[PDB]
């Protein structure tokens, strides 16, 4: 239950960088569960959208393996959208 | 395309923004920008407004003359539920 969605977006982006961090080699593919796990983590208002959508979006895009850090230095601005739905 | 972020941060700085119009009588006028920020920044919910926690830090810490205290006070309080 988060108190703030900025605070929310932070925190999420933050959380799928290290969870992502832990999967070196094969970011691309956990991008998604670690959307989820940031997700559960830091909270969201709408559990369907997740923390931030458009950072998802935009990660699952760029991502690619061994190439984290760029990926998520560009992503990490991008507009999250609607928290709500 | 929308983000919470950019809302939150047009939105104290617009109602900062419009409360400066209003010297001597800020408090007064604390919801009347928070309107404006609403207006002009957007929100997910237009009752809820941009950032519905630094509406209600204004209203308790506004007082006239002293709005930059206020503003930098409340600007980084959480906004609450922006849906409801």
């Not at 992502?20 to 709408?46: H, I, P």
């Not at 991502?63 to 984290?68: E, Q």
Request: net charge neutral; aromatic share 8%; proline share 4%.
């Amino acid at each position: 239950g988060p108190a703030d969605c900025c605070r929310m977006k932070e925190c999420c982006t933050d959380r799928v960088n290290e969870c992502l961090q832990r999967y070196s080699g094969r970011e691309d593919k956990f991008v998604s569960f670690c959307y989820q796990e940031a997700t559960v983590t830091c909270g969201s208002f709408n559990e369907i959208v997740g923390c931030c959508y458009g950072y998802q979006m935009c990660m699952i895009r760029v991502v690619k393996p061994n190439s984290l850090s760029g990926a998520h230095e560009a992503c990490k601005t991008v507009s999250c959208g609607n928290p709500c739905a």
